[PDB]
Write a protein that binds this DNA or RNA. Structure first.
Ligand SMILES: [K+]
Ligand SMILES: [Mg+2]
Ligand SMILES: [Mg+2]
Ligand SMILES: [Mg+2]
Ligand SMILES: [Mg+2]
Ligand SMILES: [Mg+2]
Ligand SMILES: [Zn+2]
Lengths: 115, 119, 122, 56, 229
RNA sequence: CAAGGAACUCUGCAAAUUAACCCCGUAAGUUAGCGAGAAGGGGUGCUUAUGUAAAAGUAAGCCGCAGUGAAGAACGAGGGG
RNA sequence: AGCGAAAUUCCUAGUCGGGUAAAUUCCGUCCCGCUUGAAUGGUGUAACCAUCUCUUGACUGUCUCGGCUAUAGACUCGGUG
RNA sequence: ACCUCGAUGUCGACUCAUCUCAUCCUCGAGCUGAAGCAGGUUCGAAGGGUUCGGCUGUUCGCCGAUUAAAGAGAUACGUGAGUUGGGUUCAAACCGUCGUGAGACAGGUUGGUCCCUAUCUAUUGUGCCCGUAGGAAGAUUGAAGAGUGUUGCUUCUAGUACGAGAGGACCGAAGCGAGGACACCUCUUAUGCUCCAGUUGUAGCGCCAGCUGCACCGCUGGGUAGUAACGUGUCUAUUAGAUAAACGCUGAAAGCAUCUAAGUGUGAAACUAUCUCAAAGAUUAAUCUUCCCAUUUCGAAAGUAAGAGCCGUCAAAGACGAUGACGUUGAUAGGUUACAGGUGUAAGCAUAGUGAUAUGUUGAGCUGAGUAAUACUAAUUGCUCGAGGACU
């Protein structure tokens, strides 16, 4: 008959999270992960700075960059994912929407907090 | 083959658009090729719609496009636009111009088209 | 994607500072090793007080990759430098201690020893 | 790459079968009489009952 | 066998999260209820099939022989008619919806007219390889290889029928099998299929019961959220 | 043009990196002239004040992912005929 | 004398050591030099080379492996031909 | 020494493969100096698959590390009107050696121009005309065909059978992969020249600020739609028939024995189908449904109230044609309006500051193609072709 392609958006309202805190590119958040090997789901926390916050619906994704023992790891999670929970700790100052320059910025390269 | 003309680079297309919109606002009619007319029309419409509010931001945004012609200079053409052309169209939602097809040219059998604008 | 002839850092205590992929193992034309694939490697730099001298051909298990790989859950784990640990013939590392983090995707293939000695798994 | 054998007067005529021209569509402008090719403006400068040009 | 089929229009693609801790890409297919327009019986017409009419349209935008066929057969006018072989368990003049045909999580296959990719060359078309570019390898270095089969009258002296050279690619029918169905939406008359479906966003998409795994179903649930604040 | 970085190949052919100015520092060998721009590194933008006669410089401050912000400027080491 | 598998060595892809995961090419070395050799010069030699030959850091679409974009053609229309 | 010297381009590599079986692997069976595992050989089988690298001009080869395996061959020792020129082999030069000498040597070495706009056929695609005996629209069957077919590792069966003991399965089920193919772009990535921001220089808009051209798009950081993969889904199953090798049950000729002569079976990746695709130009021209039409006054010429074409607006299509949507009774493109996504706090104003500039208005302004409404502009008050079913 006729289509809107707000149907794509409609079917995605079946699973969208309620709160989903808002955080721009350069923010320091802790993203707690549920893990289930056999039973007794363990919560591995994974704190770090954010790089990118792309997304257009149920597919909002974001990058978190952590440093362990001088070794950096960037991990990309899907925001509207059961089995992930996100808390915001610090909100940083930034001029860009995808701070790719942090791939080559070592220690003593930290965003100034925002007032 | 090797040495070749610069050709229709993107700058050439955009600069042709600017010259033709300047010419159509200045006089009110253009006799060009059809497939440049359909491409000039879009920018023409966007300018005339952006020019109905008259704040200085709109003057800046339109200054980015116009060029001076034999009839009007650019700072005269801006006043001529915002005084009589833009307000005349202030109530029409879209449809600020028409492109009608003339006869084929003798030189190239291209499809000459006339671009104009009336209420 | 660690490819044939790809020098990748070593993340254990065997003194093998630089090690070059020599033949990605596992079937014909594997031509790419992702997380957990066992490769065969050759040391090209070492330290004098080390259990591997320069030139020996050994086997390695890759732990860190720069390209990373899309996990099933949708999280996409990406590192910044390629690392490998040196295994001896069943699953067991030649090194006493592992440096830096290690990706979990070794857990199901085996190498429960390599995950245990790691500082912290991701 | 050259022909090995001359293409006769028969093969050449057959190829040109698809070369024939088309008679272009013709309409009769109202507001005057003449055969302007359809969907154009005639030399009146009138297209339909609207004026878009000069006398000729 | 008892092949079941339905038609729709592919509206786009997205993803949805399930139990078993898995992300599942999805195609969304708008399925207006169809209408059987003819049934072919084995004895009468030498085979069996069911003819389905769909994409309802106004009677004006329809050719006269077709609208006459619809008025005589007591149907709603439809832009499209096509038929499915070996659909048997249905009668005449009935509305068919996807909910009445397919289980919640079972296996279907999808046919759709693919994406027209233009006149494309051999190396993109047949996955051929590209002649080296270094060491000055001469300007025809994007070709179909040597088409040789034999030089001299004894050997082959021609090109083989059904060679692999450049030509038209896309806008041809293809089918992906064993793609499970995730869920439905009766409100929008809409269905969710796993995997990626051929064809552009908005084409016509046929779903049949998969021949490889006819009745096989393995249920897959969803992943209702429990994080609110 | 991601990851890799010479595996293609007859050969790193071609293509790529460095690139001006200013300040450190610069081996083996030798006809003691050179080697040597050796190797290897750092700084560069705008504002204020100080700068001398102009300027380079100096201290403080400010922005950006990056400051000869574009263009035009050496790739190098080791052994052999 | 010197030097020596050489721009010279057929058997010869000589042997041995180094490089190398692996080395008919490469560096050094022994000498039955088939036929090296002293102004048709011998042996060394710093600098120099749009010369040759080998190893290597950085470096890169050379390559696993192929993709995308923009122009001029190509293709279509009118004209010459 | 039979065609070819009024020219049939020659080694090796690259690309593309194609075919044969005397089989390397995968598959089925026998015999064993076969306990098990792993083998040795023979029989059938050509559906598919059959590595990457160092050295060398290389084939060949030696060597490393893999793999289930790294087959032997043919096709002008396939393939230069496809590519390369490293080698052989032009002139230059040199060492060894021969010759008195000019020069020579399948002895060595350094360097050294590879032309062609395809007419026929072949082939890949895509069309025009016509036919299919009324004319048009749709839906079909499928004769004759095309494409795909590879395989491992782990766990259980079970440390069971076997064997003294190390060691250790057939048959069968499940899971994760490698290579190859078909699509797609939700996620990750590359691009993405009328997108967004920063930014140097000079020249212009009279000046400041703010903008424009120009410099690889001027450079750099992001990037919508599209397009692809390194990405994500699916496939590479399974079942049936007739079979080769082998095995048979009954069973004689040849009173026993005997798988065959009659009768009756088991059986493989091969074969014919199952699966994917295309297909009535299959002139042997098929089938179904719907629609429209019967005259003229002497074979004509009249030639549909069904439809198709020209013409215009176009993209889900696109080299041009063709396919497909729409043509005022309309949402086909453009524009406008609202929005998404992308960029990332505009210009101007006020405060602090001597000043670059920071802070508030401000998650602001902007935005090619994206999503959807909206007749304002453009799709015209047109043209042509075309029915009477000829006889048994
Ligand atoms: K000859
Ligand atoms: Mg001849
Ligand atoms: Mg022609
Ligand atoms: Mg040439
Ligand atoms: Mg022409
Ligand atoms: Mg040529
Ligand atoms: Zn007229």
């Amino acid at each position: 008959k006729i289509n809107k392609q707000a149907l794509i958006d409609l079917v995605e309202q079946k699973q969208l999270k309620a709160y989903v805190p808002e955080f721009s590119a350069g923010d320091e958040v802790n993203v707690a992960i549920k893990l289930k090997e056999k039973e007794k789901v363990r919560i591995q926390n994974f704190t770090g700075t954010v790089l990118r916050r792309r997304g257009k619906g149920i597919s909002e994704t974001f990058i978190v960059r952590k440093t362990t023992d001088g070794i950096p790891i960037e991990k990309n999670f899907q925001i509207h994912n059961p089995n992930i929970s996100i808390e915001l700790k610090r909100r940083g100052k930034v001029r860009r929407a995808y701070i790719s320059y942090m791939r080559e910025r070592s220690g003593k390269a930290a965003k100034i907090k925002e007032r | 083959s090797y040495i070749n003309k610069p050709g229709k680079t993107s700058a050439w297309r955009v600069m042709t658009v600017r010259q033709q919109v300047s010419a159509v606002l200045a006089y009110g009619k253009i006799e060009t090729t059809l497939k440049k007319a359909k491409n000039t029309q879009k920018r023409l419409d966007k300018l005339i719609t952006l020019a109905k509010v008259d704040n200085f931001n709109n003057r800046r945004q339109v200054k980015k496009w116009l060029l001076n012609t034999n009839l009007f200079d650019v700072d005269q053409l801006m006043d001529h636009l915002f005084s009589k052309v833009a307000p005349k169209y202030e109530k029409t939602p879209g449809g600020y111009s028409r492109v009608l097809k003339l006869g084929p040219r003798r030189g190239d059998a291209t499809e000459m088209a006339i671009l104009q604008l009336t209420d | 994607m660690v490819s044939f002839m790809t020098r990748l850092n070593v993340a254990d205590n065997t003194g093998a500072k630089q090690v070059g992929i020599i033949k990605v193992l596992g079937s014909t034309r594997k031509r790419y090793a992702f997380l957990g694939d066992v490769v065969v490697v050759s040391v090209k730099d070492a330290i004098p007080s080390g259990m591997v001298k320069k030139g020996q051909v050994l086997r390695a298990v890759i732990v860190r990759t720069k390209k990373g790989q899309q996990r099933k859950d949708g999280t996409h784990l990406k590192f910044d430098d390629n690392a490998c640990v040196l295994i001896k013939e069943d699953k067991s590392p030649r090194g006493t201690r592992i440096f830096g983090p290690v990706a979990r995707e070794l857990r199901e293939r085996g190498y429960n020893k390599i995950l245990s000695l790691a500082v912290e798994v991701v | 790459a050259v022909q090995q054998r001359r293409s006769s007067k028969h093969r050449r005529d057959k190829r040109r079968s698809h070369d024939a021209l088309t008679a272009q569509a013709l309409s009769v402008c109202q507001k005057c009489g003449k055969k302007k090719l359809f969907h154009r403006v005639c030399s009146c400068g009138m297209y339909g009952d609207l004026r878009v040009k000069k006398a000729y | 066998m008892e092949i079941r089929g339905i038609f729709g229009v592919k509206v786009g693609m997205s993803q949805v999260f399930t139990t078993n801790n898995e992300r599942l890409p999805i195609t969304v297919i708008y399925c207006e209820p169809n209408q059987v327009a003819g049934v072919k019986t084995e004895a009468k017409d030498k085979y069996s099939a069911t003819l389905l009419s769909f994409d309802t349209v106004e009677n004006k935008k329809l050719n006269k022989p077709q609208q006459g066929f619809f008025e005589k057969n007591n149907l709603k006018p439809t832009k499209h008619l096509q038929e499915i072989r070996n659909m048997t368990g249905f009668e005449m003049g009935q509305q068919i919806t996807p909910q009445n045909l397919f289980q919640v999580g079972e296996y279907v296959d999808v046919s759709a007219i693919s994406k027209g990719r233009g006149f494309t060359g051999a190396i993109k078309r047949w996955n051929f390889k590209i002649g080296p570019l270094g060491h000055g390898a001469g300007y025809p270095h994007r070709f179909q290889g040597s088409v040789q089969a034999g030089r001299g009258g004894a050997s082959a002296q021609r090109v083989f029928k059904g060679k692999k050279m450049s030509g038209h690619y896309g806008h041809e029918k293809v089918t992906v099998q064993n793609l499970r169905i995730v869920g439905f939406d009766e409100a929008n008359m809409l269905v969710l299929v796993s995997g990626a479906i051929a064809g552009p966003e908005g084409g016509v998409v046929l779903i049949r019961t998969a021949k490889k795994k006819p009745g096989v179903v393995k249920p897959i649930e969803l992943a209702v959220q429990t994080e609110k604040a």
